[PDB]
Design a protein around this ligand. Structure first.
Ligand SMILES: *[C@@](C)(CO)[C@](*)(O)[C@H](Cc1ccccc1)NC(=O)[C@H](Cc1ccc(OC)cc1)NC(=O)[C@@H](C)NC(=O)CN1CCOCC1
Ligand SMILES: [Mg+2]
Lengths: 211, 222, 231, 240, 233, 195, 235, 244
């Protein structure tokens, strides 16, 4: 996998690939690596698929119970912490999970990185998975706070493409999300095969590749 | 040292139609270079119009199926004989598999049936419980042989329309149950030729709104 | 009197009053009738409502494909005991690939109820059960009392005014036992039997509850317009 | 373990042990809570039967649960320490797991839940304590005042009193406290709290304790002289 | 986790038209030492089932006691213990299969390979395998250890699929089993000449044969074999 | 994490802690604050295995904050350091020890003295004028041995600290992304926003 | 003294029967089920005018499709609500679907008789559990501390229950609208309440398939009270 | 079953009192009087042994005054055996604190811990409470010299001067009369003995019927010294103050 997420002026972008591997064999061409915890909360998935699905869906149960007890939505900070504490229970037992908890709350947009070690980091921009290095390259050189929703969606989409191309264990398709104060908005599934040729022509990039 | 796991071979295949679904699997059971049985059923009718197959280590596969069948029974008791939907069964199975996260069921599991809108459904699992709904999935020994064939012949991958030369794709027309069964048989005949653990027999379970039907076909016994 | 404070105390005449008081809860409960032939076994239950706005309390519970019971008394206690049966029926299937014998099911209920009558702190079960089933030795009907006593019978009845239905079955014994391969006629005999225990009220569509099990018949419960045929 | 059911129903549908716990609260010294427009004041009676007391070290009637929430009580003193300790542990546990301090409503709900648990658990008796819990939620300027009691029920109050002769001071508060216009300043809020205690206290010397809690973790306890000035001004206006 | 010490080799079996046959030699090996020569590894349960066990003998003796205790327990409060509610092969197998899989799941297995052969109430043949891993399978022919490699090929020439079962008689089936036992005696180093054979027929019931020997053996051709290549004398 | 430094001057304690957080071959964050305020006049920096560090620090923080509320009183830096040491000494013989090394910088309001305590994951406590964990000391202690006086001002302490960071930046193979510096004195805890 | 799980000579559990007496002392709660939704209404019954009435929470959300009203020793309900919310969301976790109202009610009632010498006594509170699912539609249940639960078309619990139930006997029919049910709850509450009914001392709520469970605003209820007064004065 | 014989030690009376606590206090009211007086430069502990014998070995005897650590001591009123159970727990608690924080335990924290243990026996467990009232005399660097008392209810309070045991009503009136805030240890010693001499049920107050102790900063420079008085030293202070 390759996942990314970043905060900006108009909320937070979340982009992920869809490939799944079992060794060198591509077990899946299209797997959902985002979980809709609630209308204002998202969670990315990298590492063991089973671990990512089980624990983040269990987080959603616990985030839902929060709303019922308190009559109010859980913060991104609190949600990320519940998940990190879950990881801390199975400390050294062999879980493999890297996720970004993305959402909008009273403090504005929120983004937290969380992994199997229990690490929990707040930040503007994150990227996880085998192809995170390729994504960071595009992100770091093109990121601004002053990005438009249209340009930001493209940046996250283009950054996954960069990774899908170079990283053998990343690809398939790109799933896009945009989180606002009215909730997250799904911006579709984009095949990398088709997206690559399109971007190559329109952008002029990937000159070395023949098409 | 005692190895609690084993490999009983076999291969399974699930395909979701427009208003039907199939779950096929060979009937050969093996250890190493020996055949245990030429006909040992691997795909099961679990009730509520759901079919299931746990391929890999037979002992864990039989245990999982047995527990899911049991989960269906108690779902009826606890919820006033309500029908267990295919999506609900899938999520239930995830929790069954993850209950042994640190001593896994060594099986690749597939279930097939119909969703609540009457359309065909296939769900695929890994040994630790990650799942997702799919249209097409081969699992087990010859999975890597069969899947590329299904990408080509079911989803028309890398197939374009003549004359356009790569500009226009082959449109994704739906397949009938008769067409699917042909692809299933050719998949297993091809897998039998080039995979030593595949052969003897092929058993297919077809699910429609009318119920669950079975079909059996001989395979090469060498 | 002085010996009814708990289940662990015999009276001077050798009686267990807490068990007898638990038995009393069954007599207050609504009537239910059980009867069988050589091919089928039938439960018939008069359901009770709280008022006109309320639903009619369910009386019959399924335990397995080949076994089930009807209750009279504390409904929650029936839920506990039926849940236990479900587990025992299920243990027999999973471990031995064997359908649980109705007689053995009775022995298990007897032993579970007994433990509550001899120990301090707990209480007897406040419910009576009529268990029907079809196993390898044919059709069966059991009567469970929370004293622990389980009895295999051709027919019986428990609950309020159950003596009327029990007398009827005692007269009809030779007739209804011979009703083989005819489920509707066996149910009719049960509906006619439970009718002997009615006063003021009569059998309506949401009042009556019927269950049946047999040779090629899984345990199935009939409620609502499904029992209008027999009214 | 000792499992004996001490709190049980009686034929008339009463749990006497819970009701007798309320009698212990009735015996306790008077405590009062009044919330103004931008503050809450907690007043507490100190019975003057005990002189030669060291007021530096004697357990104060008002206790900080966190930097932004306080708790006063009426009833058994020893029992109140257990509830306070549990509340303080939960406050740190909440900060640690959720990264926000507790709301006043949450803290109250927890303490009330503890009290309730002790009314249907084996081998334990109910807390002979009613509490007044006051404070301000994080990043909020709306005053909060709650009450709990042995049964485990809790509720929010514009003003409330508990303990001995609480019937009398509640009578006073009901006629003196206006909801449409609550004590606008700290002075007015403290003055009304002292006035209410003067209906019951006896002497206005060292018998009255006052603790003012303002927003953003601003909690202070008034001294004897500061309170004595309120006592002086009240009676001088009364001589008319 | 353990290692097997005193072991029993192949158990072989097959279905025929009216029932099942099962056989196993009477040897209890201690590694390469042929230590115990009077070990019965076929254990009847009632008059309708024979359980054949290979592998660790101490675990076999434990299983033997579980089955003996199973018969006792089934008779309790059971007036139909010798009739409708008697133990079936399918009950006995599933019990063992449950035990084997539970033990492997606790990482403390019964180091065995078991074949349960019998005839059901309705006259159906029962033949199913289970081992230390809890792995189960059924087939017209079944064999454990070396039997799987050498006996099955010979027995499958008689009953190659399900449709061959009604065509196979008890005489043909027994002949095939006895020949297989000879082949195993030629080629399995942990085998013995003495063996036991059991037939469970739906008409004639349970026939248990003890003290059988491998006979009609071919050794004469050995006299002509000299050296390992070039030696003539 | 990697580099944490501490220096006790005349009237304050200064803690410097790196900003980098690495995961695999990628630096995930370059602004991480490896410290927790235990009480108004006591600061604890930390470094060790991923996840364990923050979990331990926050657990200590909660315990000290609980004590502060219960007694309406701030524990002395010495008392806090002893509590922390015991928890680590308790931890090292546990089934899964917490692999965390800490520096505790505090100003004792009773004695009117700054105090620096160095405690490693084994529970090895030492009071020092300047301290470090891991490889940090190898590069920096020679400079500190040379330049350190006990009568140094806070400004001179910061200048000597800059020299230590410059030496680290020159001779370490490791890019630790600079340091966050915090000062602990009689007036409490404050952060030097430009370093 | 005597066992907590003791049977009386009439065949009833003393403690269960005594807990029912505590529920009779509780404030009135009424539920009315219709084909457009289920309405839940309660008497708040503030003990003093200084008690902020909006903090009285006797109507509670269990899930988006299930609501709950209480009467009796309301402090006992909190653990029951917590269990119900957990059961509801846990089933959603295991089965990716909403839980049936009956199944939720059954889960709550399983706690009831878990008392002895487990908790030390039965619950001293009755619950009206109202909700909607796809299988059985709009449903109203009455959960008692006996472990028994009856389904109801309409039900009143609390101090004015038998008087209110007799009124619900006459008024309820199978073609009631949601608006008609709302006014009917208000009408019967106003009848049995000691103090004069208004938006501050009485609360309304409903559960519909579209909008789910909703507690009514005091402004919204006030209009329904004014609408009630005018229609009663109309004849 | 066993329920029949259960006294139920942890229940409220209809008036809202704890039966056993009240009856334990009744027990304590028959115990020998113990007095504590706090001064600006130290604390005094004085206590009366109950109807002794001439054959009692006094110099090795201890029934009233116990040492918890070097800074804190207690006077006992009630069942001596009950008190020793609590005293040993308090001694351990002080050492736990010292091991954890490397500082001597503050007086109040020790008092609160013991008082919490007493409280527990009144709320859960079904056991009888400890029939003991303590007077805690101690010093720490936060509040300086402190006097506390705890009783079977687990309630504790701070005092300038206080009595427990027999005739506390009479004793407290006498202390309230003659006590002043600027008082010193030597004066407090005299007040304590004079109060006992007037409240005692015995014919006359003698050395063999007394236990006596002081906690003084009268130790060489900034530190505190505990002095458990010997029989001969109690005899001397009785002559000095003019009682015998
Ligand atoms: C890339 C692919 C890294 O390899 C990325 O992290 C994805 C993340 C991901 C998250 C959620 C769902 C799907 C994918 N990871 C994988 O694809 C992992 C790689 C991996 C293997 C083994 C591991 O040991 C702990 C960790 C990571 N693959 C899997 O998890 C793989 C074993 N599972 C599946 O393929 C499950 N699918 C197969 C198709 O049927 C449905 C279930
Ligand atoms: Mg092949």
């Amino acid at each position: 996998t390759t996942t990314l997420a970043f905060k900006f002026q108009h909320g937070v972008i979340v982009a992920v690939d869809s490939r799944a591997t079992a060794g060198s064999y591509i077990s899946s061409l299209r797997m959902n690596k985002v979980i809709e915890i609630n209308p204002y909360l998202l969670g990315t998935m990298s590492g063991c698929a089973a671990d990512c699905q089980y624990w983040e869906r269990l987080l959603a149960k616990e985030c839902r119970l929060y709303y019922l007890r308190n009559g109010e939505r859980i913060s991104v900070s609190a949600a990320s912490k519940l998940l990190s504490n879950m990881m801390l229970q199975y400390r050294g037992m062999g879980l493999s999970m890297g996720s970004m908890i993305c959402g909008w709350d009273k403090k504005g947009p929120g983004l937290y990185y969380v992994d199997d070690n229990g690490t929990r980091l707040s930040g503007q921009m994150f990227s996880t998975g085998s192809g995170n290095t390729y994504a960071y390259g595009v992100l770091d050189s093109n990121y601004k706070w002053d990005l438009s929703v249209e340009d930001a969606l493209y940046l996250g989409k283009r950054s996954i493409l960069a990774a899908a191309h170079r990283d053998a264990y990343s690809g398939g398709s790109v799933n896009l999300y945009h989180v606002t104060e009215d909730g997250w908005i799904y911006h579709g599934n984009h095949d990398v095969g088709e997206l690559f040729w399109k971007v190559k022509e329109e952008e002029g990039s990937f000159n070395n590749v023949i098409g | 040292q005692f190895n609690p796991y084993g490999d009983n071979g076999g291969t399974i295949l699930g395909i979701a139609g427009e208003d039907f679904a199939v779950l096929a699997g060979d009937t050969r059971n093996i250890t190493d270079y020996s055949i245990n049985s030429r006909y040992e059923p691997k795909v099961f009718d679990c009730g509520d119009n759901i079919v299931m197959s746990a391929n890999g280590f037979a002992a864990d596969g039989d245990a999982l199926v047995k527990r899911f069948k049991n989960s269906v029974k108690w779902y009826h008791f606890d919820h006033n004989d309500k029908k267990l939907s295919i999506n609900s069964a899938a999520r239930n199975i995830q929790h069954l598999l993850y209950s042994r996260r640190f001593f896994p069921y060594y099986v690749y599991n597939i279930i097939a049936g119909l969703d609540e809108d009457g359309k065909g459904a296939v769900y695929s699992f890994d040994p630790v419980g990650s799942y997702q709904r799919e249209q097409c999935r081969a699992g087990g020994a010859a999975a890597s042989l069969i899947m590329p064939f299904l990408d080509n012949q079911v989803n028309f991958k890398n197939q374009y329309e003549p004359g356009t030369n790569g500009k226009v794709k082959k449109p994704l027309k739906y397949l009938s149950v008769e067409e699917v069964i042909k692809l299933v048989r050719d998949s297993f005949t091809s897998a039998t030729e080039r995979h030593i653990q595949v052969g003897d027999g092929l058993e297919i379970l077809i699910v429609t709104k009318d119920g669950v039907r079975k079909e059996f076909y001989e395979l090469k016994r060498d | 009197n002085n010996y009814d404070g708990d289940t662990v105390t015999f009276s001077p005449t050798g009686r267990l009053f807490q068990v007898e008081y638990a038995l009393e809860a069954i007599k207050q409960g609504s009537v239910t009738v059980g009867l069988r032939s050589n091919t089928h076994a039938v439960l018939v239950a008069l359901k009770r409502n709280a008022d006109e706005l309320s639903s009619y309390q369910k009386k019959i519970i399924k335990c397995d494909e080949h076994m089930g019971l009807s209750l009279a008394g504390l409904a929650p206690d029936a839920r506990v005991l039926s849940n236990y049966l479900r587990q025992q029926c299920n243990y027999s299937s999973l471990v031995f690939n064997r359908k649980l014998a109705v007689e053995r099911a009775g022995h298990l209920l007897c032993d579970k109820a007994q433990k509550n009558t001899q120990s301090y702190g707990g209480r007897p079960y406040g419910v009576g059960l009529l268990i029907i089933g079809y196993d390898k030795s044919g059709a069966h009907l059991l009567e469970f009392q929370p004293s622990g006593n389980v009895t295999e019978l051709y027919g019986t009845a428990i609950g309020a005014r159950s003596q009327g239905a029990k007398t009827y079955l005692e007269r009809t014994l030779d007739t209804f036992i011979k009703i083989d391969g005819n489920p509707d006629e066996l149910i009719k005999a049960g509906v006619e039997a439970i009718s002997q225990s009615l006063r003021d009220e009569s059998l309506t569509v949401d009042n009556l509850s019927i269950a049946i099990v047999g040779k090629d018949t899984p345990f199935t419960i009939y409620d609502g317009e499904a029992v209008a045929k027999y009214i | 373990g000792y499992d004996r059911a001490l709190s049980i129903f009686s034929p008339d549908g009463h749990i006497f042990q819970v009701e007798y716990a309320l009698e212990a609260v009735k015996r306790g010294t008077c405590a009062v809570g009044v919330k103004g427009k931008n503050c809450v004041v907690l007043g507490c009676e100190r019975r003057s039967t005990l002189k030669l007391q060291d007021t530096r070290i004697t357990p104060s009637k008002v206790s900080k649960i966190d930097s932004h929430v306080v708790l006063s009580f009426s009833g058994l003193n020893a029992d109140s320490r257990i509830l306070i300790e549990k509340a303080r542990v939960e406050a740190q546990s909440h900060r640690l797991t959720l990264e926000d301090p507790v709301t006043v409503e949450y803290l109250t709900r927890y303490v009330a839940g503890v009290q309730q648990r002790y009314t249907q658990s084996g081998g334990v008796r109910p807390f002979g304590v009613s509490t007044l819990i006051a404070g301000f939620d994080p990043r909020d300027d709306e005053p909060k005042l709650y009450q709990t009691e042995p049964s485990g029920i809790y509720s929010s109050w514009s003003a409330q009193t508990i303990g001995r002769n609480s019937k009398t001071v509640r009578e006073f508060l009901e006629k003196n406290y206006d909801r449409k216009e609550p004590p606008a300043t700290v002075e007015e809020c403290v003055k009304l709290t002292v006035r209410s205690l003067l209906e019951v206290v006896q002497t206005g010397a060292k018998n009255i304790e006052i603790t003012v809690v303002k927003p953003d973790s601003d909690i202070v306890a008034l001294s004897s002289e500061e309170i004595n000035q309120y006592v002086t001004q009240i009676e001088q206006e009364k001589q008319e | 986790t353990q290692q097997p010490i005193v072991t029993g080799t192949s158990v072989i079996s097959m279905k025929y038209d009216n029932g099942v046959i099962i056989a196993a030699d009477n040897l209890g090996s201690y590694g390469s030492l042929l230590r115990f020569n009077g070990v019965e590894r076929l254990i009847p349960v009632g008059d309708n089932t024979v359980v054949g066990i290979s592998g660790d003998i101490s675990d076999m003796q434990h299983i033997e006691r579980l089955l003996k205790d199973l018969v006792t327990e089934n008779a309790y409060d059971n007036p139909l213990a010798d009739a409708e509610e008697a133990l079936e092969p399918s009950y006995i197998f599933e019990y063992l299969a449950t035990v084997m899989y539970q033990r492997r799941s606790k990482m403390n297995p019964l180091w065995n390979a078991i074949i349960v052969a019998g005839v059901q109430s309705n006259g159906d043949q029962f033949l199913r395998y289970v081992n230390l891993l809890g792995v189960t399978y059924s087939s017209p022919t079944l064999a454990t250890g070396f039997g799987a490699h050498m006996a099955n090929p010979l027995l499958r020439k008689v009953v190659d699929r399900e449709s061959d079962i009604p065509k196979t008689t008890v005489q043909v089936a027994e002949e095939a089993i006895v020949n297989a036992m000879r082949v195993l005696y030629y080629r399995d180093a942990r085998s013995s000449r003495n063996f036991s054979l059991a037939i469970i027929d739906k008409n004639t019931g349970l026939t248990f044969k003890k003290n059988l020997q491998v006979e009609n053996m071919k050794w004469d051709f050995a006299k002509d074999i000299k050296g390992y290549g070039t030696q003539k004398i | 994490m990697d580099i944490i430094l501490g220096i006790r001057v005349q009237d304050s304690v200064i803690l410097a802690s790196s900003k980098a957080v690495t995961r695999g071959i990628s630096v995930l964050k370059d602004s991480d604050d490896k410290t927790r305020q235990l009480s108004p006049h006591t600061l604890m920096s930390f470094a060790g295995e991923a996840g364990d560090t923050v979990q331990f620090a926050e657990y200590i923080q909660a315990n000290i904050q609980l004590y502060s509320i219960r007694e309406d009183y701030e524990l002395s830096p010495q008392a806090v350091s002893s509590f922390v040491r015991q928890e680590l000494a308790k931890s090292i013989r546990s089934r899964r020890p917490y692999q965390v090394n800490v520096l505790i910088g505090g100003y004792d309001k009773k004695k009117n003295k700054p105090e620096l305590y160095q405690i490693d994951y084994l529970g090895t406590k030492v009071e020092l004028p300047y301290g470090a964990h891991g490889y940090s000391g190898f590069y920096t202690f020679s400079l500190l041995d040379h330049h350190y006086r006990p009568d140094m001002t806070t400004e001179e302490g910061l200048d000597l600290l800059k020299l230590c960071v410059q030496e680290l930046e020159k001779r370490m193979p490791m890019d630790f992304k600079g340091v966050i510096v915090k000062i602990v004195d009689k007036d409490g805890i404050r952060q030097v926003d430009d370093f | 003294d005597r066992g907590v799980s003791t049977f009386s000579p009439e065949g009833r559990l003393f403690q269960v029967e005594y807990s029912l007496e505590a529920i009779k002392l509780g404030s009135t709660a009424i539920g009315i089920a219709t084909k457009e939704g289920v309405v839940l209404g309660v008497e708040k019954r503030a003990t003093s005018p200084l008690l902020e009435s909006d903090s009285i929470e006797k109507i509670v959300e269990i899930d988006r499709h299930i609501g709950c009203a209480m009467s009796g020793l309301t402090a006992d309900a909190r653990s029951m609500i917590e269990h119900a919310r957990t059961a509801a969301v846990t089933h959603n976790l295991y089965y990716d679907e909403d839980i049936n109202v009956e199944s939720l009610t059954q889960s709550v009632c399983d706690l009831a008789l878990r008392f002895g010498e487990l908790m030390s006594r039965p619950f001293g509170v009755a619950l009206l559990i109202a909700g909607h699912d796809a299988d059985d539609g709009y449903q109203l249940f009455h959960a008692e501390p006996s472990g028994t639960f009856y389904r109801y078309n309409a039900k009143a619990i609390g101090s004015g229950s038998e008087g209110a139930q007799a009124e619900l006997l006459n008024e309820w029919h199978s073609s009631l609208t949601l608006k008609e049910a709302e006014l009917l709850v208000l009408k019967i509450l106003k009848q049995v309440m000691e103090e004069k009914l208004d938006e501050n001392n009485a609360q309304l709520s409903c559960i519909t398939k579209q909008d789910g469970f909703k507690i009514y605003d005091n402004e919204k209820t006030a209009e329904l009270i004014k609408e009630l007064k005018e229609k009663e004065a109309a004849e | 079953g066993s329920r029949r014989y259960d006294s139920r030690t942890t229940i409220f009376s209809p008036e809202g009192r704890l039966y056993q606590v009240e009856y334990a206090l009744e027990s304590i009211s028959h115990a020998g009087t113990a007095i504590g007086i706090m001064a600006s430069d130290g604390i005094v502990l004085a206590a009366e042994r109950k109807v002794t014998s001439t054959l009692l070995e006094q110099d090795t005897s201890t029934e009233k005054l116990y040492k918890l650590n070097d800074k804190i001591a207690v006077a006992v009123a009630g069942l001596t055996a009950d008190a020793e159970i609590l005293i040993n727990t308090a001694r351990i608690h002080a050492q736990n604190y010292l091991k954890t924080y490397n500082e001597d335990i503050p007086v109040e924290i020790l008092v609160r811990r013991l008082s919490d243990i007493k409280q527990g026996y009144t709320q859960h467990g079904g056991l009888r409470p400890f029939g003991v009232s303590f007077i805690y005399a101690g010093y720490d660097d936060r509040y300086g010299y402190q006097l506390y008392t705890s009783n079977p209810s687990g309630n504790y309070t701070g005092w300038k001067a206080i009595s427990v045991g027999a005739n506390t009503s009479a004793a407290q009136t006498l202390l309230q009369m003659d006590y002043k805030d600027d008082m010193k240890v030597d004066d407090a010693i005299e007040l304590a003995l004079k109060t006992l001499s007037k409240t005692t049920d015995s014919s006359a107050l003698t050395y063999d019927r007394l236990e006596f102790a002081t906690i003084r900063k009268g130790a060489n420079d900034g530190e505190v010294y505990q002095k458990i008085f010997k029989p001969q030293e109690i005899k001397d202070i009785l002559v000095k103050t003019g009682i015998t």
